Amino acid sequence: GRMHSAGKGISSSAIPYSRNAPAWFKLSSESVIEQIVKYARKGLTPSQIGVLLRDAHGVTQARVITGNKIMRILKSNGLAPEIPEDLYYLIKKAVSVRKHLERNRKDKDAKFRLILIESRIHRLARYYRTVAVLPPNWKYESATASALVN
Amino acid sequence: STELTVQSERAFQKQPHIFNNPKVKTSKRTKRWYKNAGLGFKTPKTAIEGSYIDKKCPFTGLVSIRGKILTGTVVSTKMHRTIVIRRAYLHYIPKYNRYEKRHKNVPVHVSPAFRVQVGDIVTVGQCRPISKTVRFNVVKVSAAAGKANKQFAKF
Amino acid sequence: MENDKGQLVELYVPRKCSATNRIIKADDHASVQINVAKVDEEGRAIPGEYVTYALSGYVRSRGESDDSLNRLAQNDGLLKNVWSYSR
Amino acid sequence: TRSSVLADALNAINNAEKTGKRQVLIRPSSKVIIKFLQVMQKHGYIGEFEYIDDHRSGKIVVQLNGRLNKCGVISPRFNVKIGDIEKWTANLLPARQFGYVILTTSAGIMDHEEARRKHVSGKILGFVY
Amino acid sequence: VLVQDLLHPTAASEARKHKLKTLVQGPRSYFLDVKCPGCLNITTVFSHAQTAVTCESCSTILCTPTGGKAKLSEGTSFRRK
Amino acid sequence: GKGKPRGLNSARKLRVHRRNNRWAENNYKKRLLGTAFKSSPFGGSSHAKGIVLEKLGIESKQPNSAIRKCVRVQLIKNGKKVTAFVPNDGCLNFVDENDEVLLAGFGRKGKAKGDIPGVRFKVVKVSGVSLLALWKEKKEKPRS
RNA sequence: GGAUAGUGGCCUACCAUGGUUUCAACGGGUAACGGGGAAUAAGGGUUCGAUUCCGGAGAGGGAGCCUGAGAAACGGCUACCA
RNA sequence: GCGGUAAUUCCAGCUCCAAUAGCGUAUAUUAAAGUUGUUGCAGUUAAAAAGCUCGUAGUUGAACUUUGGGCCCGGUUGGCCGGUCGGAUUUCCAACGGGGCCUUUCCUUCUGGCUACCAGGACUUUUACUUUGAAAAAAUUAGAGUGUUCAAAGCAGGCGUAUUGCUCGAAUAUAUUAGCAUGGAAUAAUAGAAUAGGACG
RNA sequence: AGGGGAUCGAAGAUGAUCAGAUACCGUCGUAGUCUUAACCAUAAACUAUGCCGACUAGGGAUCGGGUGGUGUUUUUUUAAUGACCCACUCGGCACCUUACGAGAAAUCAAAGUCUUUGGGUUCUGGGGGGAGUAUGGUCGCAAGGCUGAAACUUAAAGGAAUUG
Ligand SMILES: CN[C@@H]1[C@@H](O)[C@@H](O[C@@H]2[C@@H](O)[C@H](O[C@H]3O[C@H](CN)CC[C@H]3N)[C@@H](N)C[C@H]2N)OC[C@]1(C)O
Ligand SMILES: [Mg+2]
Ligand SMILES: [Mg+2]
Ligand SMILES: [Mg+2]
Ligand SMILES: [Mg+2]
Ligand SMILES: [Mg+2]
Ligand SMILES: [Mg+2]
Ligand SMILES: [Mg+2]
Ligand SMILES: [Mg+2]
Ligand SMILES: [Mg+2]
Ligand SMILES: [Mg+2]
Ligand SMILES: [Mg+2]
Ligand SMILES: [Mg+2]
Ligand SMILES: [Mg+2]
Ligand SMILES: [Mg+2]
Ligand SMILES: [Mg+2]
Ligand SMILES: [Mg+2]
Ligand SMILES: [Mg+2]
Ligand SMILES: [Mg+2]
Ligand SMILES: [Mg+2]
Ligand SMILES: [Mg+2]
Ligand SMILES: [Mg+2]
Ligand SMILES: [Mg+2]
Ligand SMILES: [Mg+2]
Ligand SMILES: [Mg+2]
Ligand SMILES: [Mg+2]
Ligand SMILES: [Mg+2]
Ligand SMILES: [Mg+2]
Ligand SMILES: [Mg+2]
Ligand SMILES: [Mg+2]
Ligand SMILES: [Mg+2]
Ligand SMILES: [Mg+2]
Ligand SMILES: [Mg+2]
Ligand SMILES: [Mg+2]
Ligand SMILES: [Mg+2]
Ligand SMILES: [Mg+2]
Ligand SMILES: [Mg+2]
Ligand SMILES: [Mg+2]
Ligand SMILES: [Mg+2]
Ligand SMILES: [Mg+2]
Ligand SMILES: [Mg+2]
Ligand SMILES: [Mg+2]
Ligand SMILES: [Mg+2]
Ligand SMILES: [Mg+2]
Ligand SMILES: [Mg+2]
Ligand SMILES: [Mg+2]
Ligand SMILES: [Mg+2]
Ligand SMILES: [Mg+2]
Ligand SMILES: [Mg+2]
Ligand SMILES: [Mg+2]
Ligand SMILES: [Mg+2]
Ligand SMILES: [Mg+2]
Ligand SMILES: [Mg+2]
Ligand SMILES: [Mg+2]
Ligand SMILES: [Mg+2]
Ligand SMILES: [Mg+2]
Ligand SMILES: [Mg+2]
Ligand SMILES: [Mg+2]
Ligand SMILES: [Zn+2]
């Protein structure tokens, strides 16, 4: 548990036993699917949105109130990004680390984490290529990474 | 490979003893002999519809399939009108009562009936010696895509 | 411990811990047999008439002999209240 | 991580009857755990077990009488062919008369004695006594 | 110890345990319908905040997040469901 | 979990690891190095004949004091000088020098036998007449 | 195409850039012919097999060849080296 | 470990032990050896965890998808009776397995042949495993038979009407990894419909 | 290779000491000690103790986070706090008592779930010495790092505990 550290922590979300639920929620799939896509229009992430519709509005889990998950809906709606968001913030993070490194190469612990972060990046891509969400030959490139974040 | 020129060799390429009479005017031009290799194997349409020549093609050629018949996946398409397949298989070590992964790389002449790609499993019938390496001949192609379509453009 | 035909052989069919259903063998010297007296109307205890249990050496050493008999006796009728099967 | 679920379950079982306990929680159940527990139950080494329902893999509560000495998994699932079932038994089973080597065959998870009579074999699974 | 009911454990000793480690895992958070009579009606908020919510009409603060459940700003009522 | 790999498919890693490790087994090693044929004074054979160079009394290690009559021998087939021991009482008066002695090991597979150090061999026959039969009276040493 | 009894880079012309390998290629060693089999007797294993049967090689070392259905023969020839 | 002056170990006589036409020895080898450890090792201090993390090959890798139920047919051993001339079979009773139906349910599909496979067309996601079989040299080995006078052997021989012949034998089993054929569908891989380039007609 | 260079201080200089005293102690003091840029890759680099996963037992403390409380403090005035208390729960640095178990023992909550022997996997070791030597390959500017035999030799070396 926790590949790149000794971290044994158990921290997660405990998903409920009720598969339909809550029984107190009105509105409908039309209302939330419309609600999803306006925030995707704004540019929020399935992680950012599902929280937003958890806190502000009345969605316990959007996977239920609509028979599809959040990203699958964005995909069908053309609002899907070209690379998944976990991979995005993986690459987006290493872009900032190596950025701090060009400022100070004296910092060894930074040079160290950059290995672990980039290891994880190459692992995700390898899987994403296996399942064909990214083309075969998709590779994480150092200098071409700053251009994929922005 | 193949896939054009039909004549590209300094030798005039033709089927043996299949004669097109010039005086007898035909609108099909070529008269093209074929057979079905047997062993419950479809002689494919492109072997008939095709314009090609090759005599090592078990459907239109003078080689006959007999003996072993083998499954294996294509690791190399790099040769023109032949290919190499990796048939893996497991080996049992009696002492340890376990298995170890092995493989054997089989060159096999691919008739220009088939479009073969790397990664496609292939069925292969045994034939007379063809080249130095090749004792076997492509017969049936078991994979028509092998993930080819799932790679797609953005939108 | 029977045989070819019929007869029971092999001396000494051993006891069992009533709590854990474990064979209690000759050398288990922390093993124990409890004799609980069955009384009659007006509280007199009827000497020689017993509800008995055997408790393995293991259960006593672990500290479970107390809670084991409490379970073992109450469901046998000698008590109520006290022990809860659920926790 | 987790490799043999069945092994994990046959553990807490043996870790129960070594501590004396008559009830053990196991997670995350299985298809094989079921059929193995079944074979254990039907020959009398456990009581009744209840698969409970979470929405993931489930749990199980197994009641064990104490008649059991050792249950356990054979970790690699070994091919055994009909003539080696004897060989396999003689190693881990206390005496000829009782105990069961239980395994998996194309005819279903079953012990060697049931295997003998049906006369099919398969890969090994575990053992119970 | 040595005998206890695993199938039917006490809900009182259950609710002390960790959300994952109960007999069946489930979330312990809640949903409240929260009121600022400066608005006639309610926006329904999740208990452990993150996003610090506004009411549909005016820009106004219901909660601010913490690690756990949110600080409900100043006067509000709430209905749990 | 006793790091030997358990896998049903780990056969190679299993049989390789043991092949790798038999080198720690000693005379497994000596088997495949050919050390019998390569080094050691005998060819890798039971006995070997040779010729006496000198008669050397060896003083035995503690807690013993003796003078153990031995012979520097040069192996015919081989050419190695090797130093061997003469058994029982006298028996050094049966050899002298330039003689042809049959040697055997000491029965320890190398590894000198006794308070006699560094001597791995023993005299069996001299002049082909079998030191026993000379020590008892059964034979006498050949004329010349 | 030549050649062979015949297939085949067997050889030859033009042509292609291919074929093997950490699933150990390639290389080095073998006091290595391989198999039937042999010893040691919980099982599992370990060790050996020049040698009475089968298969393969060779007739001092190499090549070459005649005769013939059949030999690259050696109790056939020709040459070399010994 | 014996021997430097009373030697239970040397050299001898006497006696006694072990095996016995045999016994000693050197060398290899197997068992002893769970001291090579798949079965089946040890690794804190005896020999032995890389200074630390990453990471390719290798080994390995959570759970879930036909469950349960109802109705037939046919087998082989076991009893309680036996009917009978030691075995004979039907009913009573179990015990283990095999096949087939229906409960929403292809074992490929059509065209007839026939009453279960004929042969022909058209197609079929591919594996590991486990069953059974066919094909498998003798000798060797395990082993039935046979009184080489015993025996290792050998595969002979054994019976009268031994003056004109009769006649049982020369079994069986083992053979494995791969190959072929076949019953199995558990465990474990593998492929499928998602920008539908989807399935059926 | 520059800078820096207070202090301490391998070399070296010495004063004492001893039979000797190239030392211990005293005294001076070069390199060093710091730093910039490049090298080096070793330590008893230690928990002399692989990583992932399941399970097996009580107890009070403690670190960080979170949950509950008609709990105590502050007060300015309920509040809001902020520290404190009590209980629960995850994840941590540890500690006590135990011994169902383990072990040669010292001791171990793992070193337990092992002849009733199988969760996944990496690494190492196979009497002592010769020896971490020779050799070859490779890394380094160098010192050195890595990999790494054999001949021969030898009955013990060795671990924990026990009594003297
Ligand atoms: C602390 N170092 C240890 C070393 O001491 C030793 O440890 C073993 C340990 O592996 C065995 O345990 C192992 O085998 C068990 C089988 N019953 C279960 C799995 C595993 N824990 C223990 N039974 C004995 C220890 N001394 O072997 C493994 C190791 C990691 O090197
Ligand atoms: Mg990790
Ligand atoms: Mg990792
Ligand atoms: Mg965890
Ligand atoms: Mg065993
Ligand atoms: Mg290797
Ligand atoms: Mg080596
Ligand atoms: Mg070593
Ligand atoms: Mg020799
Ligand atoms: Mg001299
Ligand atoms: Mg000595
Ligand atoms: Mg001689
Ligand atoms: Mg030819
Ligand atoms: Mg040779
Ligand atoms: Mg050999
Ligand atoms: Mg063999
Ligand atoms: Mg041979
Ligand atoms: Mg001979
Ligand atoms: Mg010849
Ligand atoms: Mg030459
Ligand atoms: Mg030569
Ligand atoms: Mg010749
Ligand atoms: Mg001759
Ligand atoms: Mg001849
Ligand atoms: Mg010359
Ligand atoms: Mg010569
Ligand atoms: Mg005397
Ligand atoms: Mg003696
Ligand atoms: Mg005497
Ligand atoms: Mg002898
Ligand atoms: Mg095994
Ligand atoms: Mg050991
Ligand atoms: Mg050590
Ligand atoms: Mg370490
Ligand atoms: Mg490394
Ligand atoms: Mg080190
Ligand atoms: Mg799985
Ligand atoms: Mg699984
Ligand atoms: Mg059914
Ligand atoms: Mg064999
Ligand atoms: Mg400097
Ligand atoms: Mg200075
Ligand atoms: Mg000085
Ligand atoms: Mg002194
Ligand atoms: Mg002093
Ligand atoms: Mg000073
Ligand atoms: Mg330390
Ligand atoms: Mg620790
Ligand atoms: Mg170390
Ligand atoms: Mg520890
Ligand atoms: Mg080491
Ligand atoms: Mg040695
Ligand atoms: Mg070293
Ligand atoms: Mg060393
Ligand atoms: Mg070193
Ligand atoms: Mg070197
Ligand atoms: Mg470099
Ligand atoms: Mg150099
Ligand atoms: Zn508002």
Tell me which chain E residues have a C-beta less than 8 angstroms from the C-beta of C67: 1-3
Token pair, residue D12, equals: 């807490």
The domain spans of chain C are: 1-87
Whether F39 and F29 have beta carbons less than 8 Å apart is answered as no
User: How far does Cα E26 stand from its chain's mean position?
Assistant: 13
Please give the Cα distance from F50 to A149 (Å, whole number): 87
Contact criterion met (CB < 8 Å) for F6 and D76 = yes
Residue nearest (by alpha carbon) to ligand 1 atom 27: F2
- Smallest CA–CA distance from E56 into chain A, residue: A56
Same domain for A71 and A98? no
> Structural domain tally of chain D?
2
The residues on C that touch D, with CB distances below 8 Å, are 19-22, 58-59, 62, 64
Q: Among the atoms of ligand 1, which is closest to the Cα of residue F3?
A: 28
Can you tell me the distance from the alpha carbon of D78 to that of D129, in angstroms, rounded to the nearest whole number?
20
Q: How far apart are the first and last CA of chain D?
A: 28
Is B152 a member of any domain? Answer: no
- Please tell me whether residues D93 and D124 are part of one structural domain: yes
Q: Check if the beta carbon of residue D54 is closer than 8 Å to that of residue E25.
A: yes
Contact A33, A65 (CB under 8 A): no
Inside any domain, residue B149 = no
Rounded CA separation B35/B47 (Å): 9
Signed CA dihedral, D17, D20, D23, D29: sign only: negative
> Residue D63: which domain range?
1-68
What CATH number did the domain enclosing B86 receive?
2.40.50.1000
The fold adopted by the segment(s) C1-87 is Hypothetical Cytosolic Protein; Chain: A; (3.30.1230)
What's CA A58's distance to the chain center, in Å? 22
A69 and A113 in a common domain: no
Quote the number of domains for chain A.
Answer: 2
- In whole angstroms, what is the distance from residue C19 CA to residue C33 CA? 12
Q: How far apart are CA B104 and CA B87, in angstroms?
A: 6
Minimal-distance CA residue to ligand 1 atom 8: F2
A127-147 per-residue burial string, b: 16 or more CB within 10 A, e: under 16 = ebbeeebbeeeeebeeeebee
Listed by start position, the domains of chain E span: 1-81
Which residues have CB under 8 Å from D108's CB, separation 6+?
D35
- F13-21: which pairs have CB atoms within 8 A and are 24 or more residues apart? F14/B93, F14/B96, F14/B98, F15/B93, F15/B95, F15/B96, F15/B100
Residue B22 lies in a domain: yes
Q: What domain count does chain B have?
A: 1
Q: Is the peptide bond before B22 cis (omega within 30 degrees of 0)?
A: no
A45/A90 same-domain check: no
Domain that holds residue B13: 5-144
CB proximity D77 to F under 8 Å: yes
Q: Cα angle at B72 between B70 and B73, to 5 degrees?
A: 155
Q: What is the DSSP letter of B13?
A: P
Ligand 40 centroid to residue B95 C-alpha, Å: 14
Specify whether the CB–CB gap between D57 and D28 falls below 8 A.
yes
| Chains with ≥3 CB–CB distances under 8 Å to C | D, E
What dihedral do alpha carbons D57, D62, D67, D71 form, nearest 10°? Answer: 10
Task: Give the domain range for residue A51.
Answer: 26-80
Rounded Cα distance, E5 and D117, in Å: 40
Query: Tokens 């000793």 sit at which residue?
Result: E13
